[PDB]
Design a protein around this nucleic acid. Structure first.
Ligand SMILES: [Mg+2]
Ligand SMILES: [Mg+2]
Ligand SMILES: [Mg+2]
Ligand SMILES: [Mg+2]
Ligand SMILES: [Mg+2]
Ligand SMILES: [Mg+2]
Ligand SMILES: [Mg+2]
Ligand SMILES: [Mg+2]
Ligand SMILES: [Mg+2]
Ligand SMILES: [Mg+2]
Ligand SMILES: [Mg+2]
Ligand SMILES: [Mg+2]
Ligand SMILES: [Mg+2]
Ligand SMILES: [Mg+2]
Ligand SMILES: [Mg+2]
Ligand SMILES: [Mg+2]
Ligand SMILES: [Mg+2]
Ligand SMILES: [Mg+2]
Ligand SMILES: [Mg+2]
Ligand SMILES: [Zn+2]
Lengths: 51, 84, 116, 54, 177
RNA sequence: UGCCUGGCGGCCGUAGCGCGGUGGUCCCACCUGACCCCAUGCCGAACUCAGAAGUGAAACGCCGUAGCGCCGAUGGUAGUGUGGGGUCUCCCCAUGCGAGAGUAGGGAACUGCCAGGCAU
RNA sequence: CCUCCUAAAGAGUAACGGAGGAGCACGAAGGUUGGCUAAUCCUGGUCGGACAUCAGGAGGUUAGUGCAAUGGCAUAAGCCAGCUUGACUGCGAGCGUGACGGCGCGAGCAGGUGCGAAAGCAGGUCAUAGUGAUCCGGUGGUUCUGAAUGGAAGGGCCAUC
RNA sequence: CGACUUACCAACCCGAUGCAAACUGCGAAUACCGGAGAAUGUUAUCACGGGAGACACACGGCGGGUGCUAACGUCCGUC
RNA sequence: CGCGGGGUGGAGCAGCCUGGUAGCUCGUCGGGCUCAUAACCCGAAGAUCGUCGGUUCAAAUCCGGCCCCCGCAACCA
């Protein structure tokens, strides 16, 4: 709906990415999270990117 | 007055019945992980060896026999699994 | 009431422990005395009990209501539990903020040997 | 068909024994005449009853 | 703590002899002193609430709590969570300090002061009195008073009834009438 | 063993509320004071800490009270499964189940474990 | 598609039957730890009232639950605050529900995390709506294949539009 | 600036009455699920596989919606 | 009878579809210029939104009806 779709790409260099939805207007700041990366099997910083 | 008049209705909507209610009744013997009752909100509560899922579905966590009892100060209904 | 609020606070962790089946080291802190009990998972049998109210513990204490009296009573209850072979319990702070006398009792028991 | 109908009048379902009208402060015979006149306007058989302790 | 000592040494004796209390612990105390100001004008300029809270901090020696709307009211154009007042609660030492300051300084500075009402006991023993002007407190500098911020003061007491409450307050030389 | 108190329960109103009284050696509570540990979207109020002067005032405990709440028969009534019957949109009979409300009445809980105090 | 009733005390059950809602929202409104308890009314109180903030009482959850209705909720699922990413990856005993496609619940196991002293809780939200199969394609990984051989094009598998 | 009544309207609470599919501090009969026990029944049960037909129903009884407690009306549940 | 609208100062219209507040013109009132009137000039007031009841903290607005006013349709036999 009003929320767009973004992908959180791993910062561990795997190329793996989670996907999620974000309210662009109300939270313009990018989103960073510590999410598990199965490729390197460690929790690493995941940062926002367009789908 | 010849044929008829006319007039639409605003209703005629409803939803698929969810098949809630007690699945395994008191005295039955369940396998671990058997759903004992699907419900909306903890109408029944989780007693011994009984777990409550997100949709408040009660599932037996141990093999045995179901047992309903009124328990607690609020006279609530608890499902327990007697060890069998 | 203060004790009503304390009971309301305690009830959640008490029920969690009671369904888990853990042997329960329940504390009870008053302005003058600090009591400790170890209770069976059914809740109706007192395994061990150490308190500052009793002479054997009190006579080695200056004031019965401070961190040092709490350490003494925690040491005593832990040693009696180890003599009864209780070994492994779980801590029931009974709503009291885990801090001060209660925490000192907990550390005394942990160092004496009770596992929690 | 095409839905239900519109509300036209309001009724009160009557079962035997229901004490419809009550009256006080009048002589008994005049009460009988008044109740006869009223019952003549109703579609249900009636009877004249009095007050009792229980 | 001057008035606290005066309490414990003379007011207790007066109350014991007067009401024949069987226990000394039955004598009324002073639980708390609450100073409030409802800055209902903050909804236009929020800064007004900050300045009023600064005045209350000057009066009390105690940073205030910013009380917000309990429920949205449209008759006053306030939404839930809008800050619309500031309050302070005083207990013990600062209780007694402010209490003495009030009685023996601020009340005399009230313009045209004739005597505080004895009808302001809320049926239990709590005294609520309204101060129209914050200039009566020397803690506030007159020359910077941008606006006449009032306030209201609630002396909360362990008295069961207004009779006992007002006897306790009057024993403190409280200016009734 | 007796009685009081504290803790953990059992049970969940015959157990709760009201009203009257009573308890401080012990316990508990109020209480005293905040470099402190710890703390209040302000406040040693609460949480916490160091204590113990005083009072059982409040709370709590106990006792007594029926004004309520609560429980509550026997009987009858309503409904109702099966089989029949009637002037059948409602009923009746045979047989089985049998309430709800109400009435008499009961009713100011009872009980286990551990610890402490007192009298032993 | 969701909720109540009809629906005849298990499930299910129709009508152009009687009532209402959905085509989302949230990086926190999620997790955890610690803490707190509502509506309303009365009394007293500067501007300030029927309704603003303050204090006390009665009351008892008659409140709240991001949005409908139901069922729940005091151990709170309601209200604050700290740290946070479990709104994790691979599975999954056993069930429930469907003609099927499918849909749901799920302890436990492995890895690696968050909160807590710890027990423990956490693979989204109190639950039930918030949605569309297949094909055809697009993007990123994957050397699985890659028509003589080595590549590559393409295709497959995994994530996703 | 300052105050009286009434002819009446009526909230809360107290007591007394009724009504409800979308009300419940109560609550059956039946039906349903599970367990044990005999007798009886040509396995009457389930799984797998070959072949189908059928998916226009009708009336009567009991519980209902709709209709006018109308219809050999219409839509349901169970015989 | 069905379906789409409309009800806003004294008259005609906006506003409302995006709930936080009602404007324009004519008219009315007071004064002014005129011997006087009209025109004209300068100031002012005026509707709480058909109506009932909801929703919402707040309803002209959203909703459900109810009342009245227009428009389309009310057919095949
Ligand atoms: Mg339908
Ligand atoms: Mg009975
Ligand atoms: Mg059903
Ligand atoms: Mg049925
Ligand atoms: Mg939430
Ligand atoms: Mg939460
Ligand atoms: Mg929800
Ligand atoms: Mg090749
Ligand atoms: Mg390739
Ligand atoms: Mg009913
Ligand atoms: Mg067909
Ligand atoms: Mg058919
Ligand atoms: Mg048919
Ligand atoms: Mg049929
Ligand atoms: Mg039939
Ligand atoms: Mg019926
Ligand atoms: Mg019929
Ligand atoms: Mg027919
Ligand atoms: Mg037909
Ligand atoms: Zn002087």
């Amino acid at each position: 709906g009003i929320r767009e779709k973004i992908k959180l790409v791993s910062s561990a260099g795997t190329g793996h990415f989670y996907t999620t939805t974000k309210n662009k207007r109300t939270k313009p700041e990018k989103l960073e999270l510590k999410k598990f990366d199965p490729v390197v099997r460690q929790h690493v910083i995941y940062k926002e990117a367009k789908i | 007055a010849h044929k008829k008049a006319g007039g639409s209705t605003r209703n005629g909507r409803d939803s698929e019945a969810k098949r809630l209610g007690v699945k395994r009744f008191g005295g039955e013997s369940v396998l671990a992980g058997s759903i004992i009752v699907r419900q909306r909100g903890t109408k029944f509560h989780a007693g011994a060896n009984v777990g409550c899922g997100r949709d408040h579905t009660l599932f037996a966590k141990a093999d045995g026999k179901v047992k309903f009892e009124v328990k607690g100060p609020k006279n609530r209904k608890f499902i327990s699994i007697e060890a069998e | 009431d203060k004790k009503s609020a304390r009971i309301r606070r305690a009830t959640r962790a008490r029920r969690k422990l009671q369904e888990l089946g853990a042997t329960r080291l329940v504390v009870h802190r008053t302005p003058r005395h600090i009591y400790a009990q170890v209770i069976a998972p059914n809740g109706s049998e007192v395994l061990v009990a150490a308190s500052t109210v009793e002479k054997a513990i009190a006579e080695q204490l200056k004031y019965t209501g401070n961190k040092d009296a709490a350490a003494a009573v925690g040491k005593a209850v832990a040693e009696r539990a180890l003599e009864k072979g209780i070994k492994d319990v779980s801590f029931d702070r009974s709503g009291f903020q885990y801090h001060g006398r209660v925490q000192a009792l907990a550390d005394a028991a942990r160092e004496a040997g009770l596992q929690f | 068909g095409k839905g239900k109908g519109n509300v036209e009048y309001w009724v009160a379902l009557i079962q035997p024994g229901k004490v419809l009208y009550e009256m006080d402060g009048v002589p008994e015979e005049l009460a009988r005449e008044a109740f006869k006149l009223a019952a003549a306007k109703l579609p249900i058989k009636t009877t004249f009853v009095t007050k009792t302790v229980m | 703590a001057k008035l606290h000592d005066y309490y414990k040494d003379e007011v207790v004796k007066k109350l014991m002899t007067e009401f024949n209390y069987n226990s000394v612990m039955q004598v009324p105390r002073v639980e708390k002193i609450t100073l409030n100001m409802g800055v209902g004008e903050a909804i236009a300029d929020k800064k007004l609430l900050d300045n009023a809270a600064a005045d209350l901090a000057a009066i009390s020696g105690q940073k205030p709590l910013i009380t917000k709307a309990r429920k949205s009211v449209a008759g006053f154009k306030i939404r839930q969570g809008y800050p619309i007042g500031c309050k302070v609660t005083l207990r013990g030492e600062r209780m007694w300090e402010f209490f003495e300051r009030l009685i023996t300084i601020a009340v005399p500075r009230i313009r045209d002061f004739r005597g505080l009402s004895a009808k302001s006991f809320d049926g239990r023993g709590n005294y609520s009195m309204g101060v129209r002007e914050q200039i009566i407190f020397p803690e506030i500098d007159y020359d910077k008073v941008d606006r006449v911020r009032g306030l209201d003061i609630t002396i909360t007491t362990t008295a069961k009834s207004d009779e006992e409450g007002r006897a306790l307050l009057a024993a403190f030389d409280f200016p009734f009438r």
